[PDB]
Design a protein around this ligand. Sequence first.
Ligand code: BCL
Ligand code: BCL
Ligand code: BCL
Ligand SMILES: CC[C@H]1c2cc3[nH]c4c(c3C)C(=O)[C@H](C(=O)OC)c4c3nc(cc4[nH]c(cc(n2)[C@@H]1C)c(C(C)=O)c4C)[C@@H](C)[C@@H]3CCC(=O)OC/C=C(\C)CCC[C@H](C)CCC[C@H](C)CCCC(C)C
Ligand SMILES: COC(C)(C)C(=O)C/C=C(\C)CC/C=C(\C)CC/C=C(\C)CCCC/C(C)=C/CC[C@H](C)CC/C=C(\C)CCC=C(C)C
Ligand SMILES: CCCCCCCCCCCC[N+](C)(C)[O-]
Ligand SMILES: CCCCCCCCCCCC[N+](C)(C)[O-]
Ligand SMILES: [Fe+3]
Lengths: 240, 302, 281
Amino acid sequence: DLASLAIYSFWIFLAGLIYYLQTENMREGYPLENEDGTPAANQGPFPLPKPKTFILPHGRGTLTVPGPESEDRPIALARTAVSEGFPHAPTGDPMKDGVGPASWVARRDLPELDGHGHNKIKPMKAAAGFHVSAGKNPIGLPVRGCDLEIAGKVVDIWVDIPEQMARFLEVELKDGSTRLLPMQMVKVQSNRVHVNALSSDLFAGIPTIKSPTEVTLLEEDKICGYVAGGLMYAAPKRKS
Amino acid sequence: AEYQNIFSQVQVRGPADLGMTEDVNLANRSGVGPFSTLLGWFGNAQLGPIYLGSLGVLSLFSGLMWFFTIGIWFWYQAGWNPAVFLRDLFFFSLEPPAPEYGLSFAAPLKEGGLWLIASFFMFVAVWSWWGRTYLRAQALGMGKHTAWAFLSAIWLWMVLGFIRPILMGSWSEAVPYGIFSHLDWTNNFSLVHGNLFYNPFHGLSIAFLYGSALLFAMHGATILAVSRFGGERELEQIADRGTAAERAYLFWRWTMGFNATMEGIHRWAIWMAVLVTLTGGIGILLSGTVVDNWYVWGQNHG
Amino acid sequence: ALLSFERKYRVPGGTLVGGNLFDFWVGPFYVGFFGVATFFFAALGIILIAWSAVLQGTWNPQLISVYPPALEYGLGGAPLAKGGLWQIITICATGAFVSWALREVEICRKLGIGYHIPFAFAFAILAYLTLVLFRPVMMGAWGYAFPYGIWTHLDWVSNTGYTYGNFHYNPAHMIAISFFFTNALALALHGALVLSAANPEKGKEMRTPDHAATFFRDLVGYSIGTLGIHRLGLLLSLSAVFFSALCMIITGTIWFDQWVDWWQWWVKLPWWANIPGGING
Ligand code: BCL
Ligand code: BCL
Ligand code: BCL
Ligand SMILES: CC[C@H]1c2cc3[nH]c4c(c3C)C(=O)[C@H](C(=O)OC)c4c3nc(cc4[nH]c(cc(n2)[C@@H]1C)c(C(C)=O)c4C)[C@@H](C)[C@@H]3CCC(=O)OC/C=C(\C)CCC[C@H](C)CCC[C@H](C)CCCC(C)C
Ligand SMILES: COC(C)(C)C(=O)C/C=C(\C)CC/C=C(\C)CC/C=C(\C)CCCC/C(C)=C/CC[C@H](C)CC/C=C(\C)CCC=C(C)C
Ligand SMILES: CCCCCCCCCCCC[N+](C)(C)[O-]
Ligand SMILES: CCCCCCCCCCCC[N+](C)(C)[O-]
Ligand SMILES: [Fe+3]
């Protein structure tokens, strides 16, 4: 009957749909690879989708996925076993090298732009008319590391203009140079800003930006990456 | 403890975003509204501007007419009494015409005509508002997923009070406008068709509902988990993948064996949700038109 | 075996239990100590399911049913064939679930991300524990729990519901549903919004998150933003399930009469109780 028809039909629709959804989620990270970088023999039941091309705004070009994928940076890792499926140990300093939880991606050395073509994120001093509207204002507070030692002082807020969101705290270290600190990895207290991820002696390691009014997708990644990596690598210097 | 990212720690405010202009008629935009420091602790604080326009107004007007044609019926039920109105508010009901009138529009005001009027207002409110979601998207040169997704929802609502009552031969088969009354109608609708738990569409529909909860819980939590790498900025992550996306993909890969992309999971999102009322719609449309009792149908399959 | 960018992430550490012992992968999958725990609890609970099925004398999944002990056994232990099997399985299930959560934690650490996922999952676990542990214990017997069977669990739901009239009248159940519907609404919107920006009208450029924001401000005069809708989603969904757990934990414990009768309280408030007309006068 009709009902039987409909439901059998549906289970078929759903299958091609789960199929469509699966291939579309392969527009990246495939083909699969062996731990040595050579293409894996088994890529699964699913073929690669036909490329699609993205036309990116502000004449910043196009993106065609799937496409040739390349790390575009040396990975300082070494095998720890003779068979596949085991961890790869850092061969240097994971933080400095940018592997493990401290990893970063070779994105664009250009800032993300707002709908108009202006830099999406700007230091609040250069963002005309922006002010702290609610909560505790961080600017002027000492910055404390997990080792419970002062690493610097907050001397501005880097704000997202279209969203009116505080993205990073600009921090002034003992030598007068500043670093950016992601707003999701800091606890704004009443008499201090506490950073659980990094100990005071590691703030200097936070990668620097080439210009004082911009950050690029590459620098955001290196910075966010480095700070998150502290959780595992700063561990021996983090107290209670 | 570490910052969990549910509520913002600090609010900064700046000049109001009158938004993008593209092919939009700015004559029809409102002024920006106040800023809510409340809305600010969880999301943006900026209210407006909004786009009113011929279809916005029609929709809005019909929308209130729906809402009021019911309001006046309740008050009259209440014996025009404010004390009663408030005590008996869920008990009021505006019911369709008796099976007696079939699909005729001649039924009286106190006996069903009023229901037709209300529905009429609702019909216009929802379709115009639909047109609104398509146009608003066109004016900015955006895809129309929001309009096609909304259509899914309209599907179920259409089937419920317009397409099914019409295929059964009468307006009495439709849903009453009332709080406790539309619940009763629902419970009853199942009792009469041999228990909806035996309808394979109802069951499918529940799977996608439960799933929507499953997936949005899954997605919401992942993005917050990687916001420490600007994960919430999904469109540029799409255009240029970050360590935020890689960590997102690998978390789910290491956990359950496969993963999505930053664009993909959003495809998984719009379908899981749209399948709720699609499947739903079908389950209900076949109930009483083709299948009189799902238990009995369940025993044979046909 | 690896995605073109996975290797630099596959570094040692993050384990909660047992150091480097189980710190490794099997194909795409991460094992970890809890990898093993869940495998163990799962293999076990499945064999215990295959075993109930022979005592039942059916190899058909539409028929297999693993039922709790009867209302006579109270909160004591039942024989295998008479409910004991269901208790071991519940222990195994719970064991599987918790273990699966803790593995999520272990993966979280290795990747240096947030714990929001294991955290959200725990709400699901709490819902299941409400239906087979908290409620029954508070009620006084293991048989108030639902059976592990495809259709029988549906029977349990329908029967438990109707024991209190039309369950729609449970106030907590009302709010719980409201969240389920709203969450599905928000999921459809969010998904639709991002896609429409990333996949514009033909030949046009990918929209900006500033367009997406506008689109919504234009539609309903407000945009929650990208950190907002994600906070929203997590919340609605967690809430739906939180209220689901509440409607059940109160049902049969502190309220055992017909849910529809509980609304008399509103109506029997002294200021408008004896006043004529309407529906309730
Ligand atoms: C929480 C609310 C009620 C209840 C009310 C209902 C109602 C009402 C319905 C279901 C439906 C289903 N229920 Mg139930 N269900 C409950 C508790 C459970 C439990 C549990 C351990 O707590 C589980 C595992 C299930 C599982 C299931 C599926 C068989 C089915 C589709 C659900 C879905 O899409 O979710 C979304 C999740 C996903 C898409 C993720 C993937 C889920 C897959 C499908 C899990 C299948 C597991 C199953 C085959 C058993 C495996 C166990 C062993 C390892 C073999 N229910 C409680 C008692 N359930 C629907 C149905 O059609 O089945 C008859 C239906 O109509
Ligand atoms: C005793 C009750 C019966 C039963 C009878 C029914 C009936 C009858 C129906 C459902 C339906 C549904 N049931 Mg059932 N159901 C039962 C038990 C359950 C159980 C359970 C036991 O755990 C669950 C989880 C469900 C779950 C569900 C949903 C999956 C499904 C509706 C999805 C939806 O989101 O529609 C919500 C969305 C809409 C209604 C779309 C409407 C959109 C419109 C356009 C909105 C307009 C708004 C307007 C402008 C005014 C708004 C105000 C302004 C915002 C201010 N049922 C038992 C067996 N169920 C529906 C279905 O699809 O069944 C197959 C349905 O018709
Ligand atoms: C006749 C039926 C009654 C009624 C009786 C009941 C009863 C009784 C109950 C509900 C419950 C619920 N009802 Mg009701 N309800 C009715 C009608 C409805 C309709 C409606 C439209 O009419 C709606 C929308 C709902 C909606 C809902 C939800 C609020 C809730 C179910 C979801 C949940 O609890 O998640 C909770 C989620 C879980 C339990 C899932 C847990 C999953 C676990 C942690 C992991 C699964 C792993 C699995 C084994 C994996 C397999 C391995 C494979 C690899 C996949 N009800 C009518 C009036 N309703 C249920 C509830 O609130 O429970 C607390 C419940 O018990
Ligand atoms: C809290 C909000 C919602 C939510 C969230 C949620 N679920 C989650 C997560 C999150 C955040 C995960 O991270 C985790 C996941 O990895 O998803 C891919 C998970 C998950 N939610 C799942 C299912 C699920 N979630 C559900 C519900 C929900 N999940 C909510 C609505 C439902 C239902 C019924 O609504 C189901 C069916 C899994 C896909 C996955 C967890 C997988 C897992 O725990 O693996 C460990 C266990 C096994 C491999 C199998 C164990 C076998 C048992 C020992 C025996 C079988 C006993 C069982 C009781 C029989 C039941 C029979 C039925 C017919 C009744
Ligand atoms: C503030 O106080 C005042 C007095 C000012 C008020 O106004 C208060 C007002 C309230 C008390 C209003 C309360 C309103 C509610 C309780 C409403 C609740 C409504 C529901 C629960 C509705 C549920 C389901 C509705 C359904 C499925 C409707 C479907 C409608 C249709 C598909 C429309 C079909 C069209 C019809 C039959 C006519 C078509 C005719 C043509 C010519 C095309
Ligand atoms: C978006 C893809 C995920 C869809 C989930 C498919 C599994 C649902 C199984 C429901 C069992 C249903 N049925 C028809 C017997 O009632
Ligand atoms: C509709 C029910 C679907 C249940 C799916 C069962 C779990 C799926 C896990 C697939 C993981 C795949 N793998 C091994 C190829 O990577
Ligand atoms: Fe998202």
